[PDB]
Structure formats: C-alpha cells, structure tokens
C-alpha cells in the first residue's frame, strides 16, 4: 500500500479509491542567500 525511502519517509502511495501508484516528490525548496555590498556602500541586494 505504501512505499518508503531510506529516511523511512513515504516514497509513493497507492490511491485507496483507484488502485494506481502516485510518486511523492517534496515541494521545491532550497537555501536562500543574499548577495550584498556592504551597507556602508549600498542597501541594494541580489538574491540567490
């Protein structure tokens, strides 16, 4: 009924009403970095 990944998290599931398999891919994420000249020069920043 359920599949699992190395972390024991759910990898895929079988839909309980219609028996098809759905992959579960966690929603996009990532670190956010701010690129900035010192604030003694400018308050403009770029975001990575």
């Amino acid at each position: 009924q359920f599949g699992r990944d190395i972390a024991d998290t759910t990898d895929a599931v079988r839909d309980p009403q219609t028996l098809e398999i759905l992959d579960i891919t966690p929603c996009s994420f990532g670190g956010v970095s701010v690129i900035t000249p010192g604030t003694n020069t400018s308050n403009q920043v770029a975001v990575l």
């Binding site: 990944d5 190395i6 972390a7 998290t9 891919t25 966690p26």
Partner: peptide, 23 residues
Amino acid sequence: PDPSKPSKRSFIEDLLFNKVTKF
C-alpha cells in the same frame, strides 16, 4: 590541454576524471 575536447583537459587528466566517482 587537448583543444578537441568540450573542456580543455589533457589526456592524462581525462584518465584521472574517469577513475574517481536528498529531500
């Protein structure tokens, strides 16, 4: 360096790169 490659590496360097290999 070998000018014919997509990355100008030498013959020997290519050999080295071909030997060393969530949510």
